[model samples]
Target: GWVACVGACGTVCLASGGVGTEFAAASXFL
Candidate 1:
């Protein structure tokens, strides 16, 4: 679900910061 994916990205950003933002942008269509 999108909720889960968004939350996952939220967690990733907590650790990887900008890197996770990049990943989130890249995975936006997923």
Candidate 2:
């Protein structure tokens, strides 16, 4: 899951897409 989903979460969560889970799931390198 460490391919290209670190900051991409910003784009995915740009519309408020599970900002919480996404962040904690990767903010600390998931």
Candidate 3:
């Protein structure tokens, strides 16, 4: 058996939005 590394990253984009919108987009970054 072997383990694989996916090396994944999350991105958040904000445009004329508020904290709710920015954090909402960045939720997946964690």
Cα RMSDs, all models = 3.2, 4.8, 8.7
lDDT top scorer = 1
**Which ten contiguous residues of candidate 3 have the minimum total lDDT?**
1-10
TM-score of each: 0.39, 0.31, 0.25
Query: Which model, 1 or 2, shows the larger lDDT?
Result: 1
lDDT of 2 by residue, 1-30 (tens): 565666566665666656574664375364
Q: Give the Å error, residue 24, model 3.
A: 1.0
- Model 3 TM-score? 0.25
Backbone clashes counted, model 1: 0
Task: Report the CA-based lDDT of candidate 2 relative to the real structure.
Answer: 0.59
- lDDT per residue for candidate 3 within 1-30, as digits (tens), equals 111111111122333334455445444444
- Ranking by TM-score, best first? 1, 2, 3
Stretches of candidate 3 exceeding 4 Å from the true structure: 1-19
Q: What clash count goes with each model? A: 0, 0, 0
Could you tell me which 10 consecutive residues in candidate 2 have the lowest summed lDDT? Answer: 21-30
lDDT of 2 at 20: 74
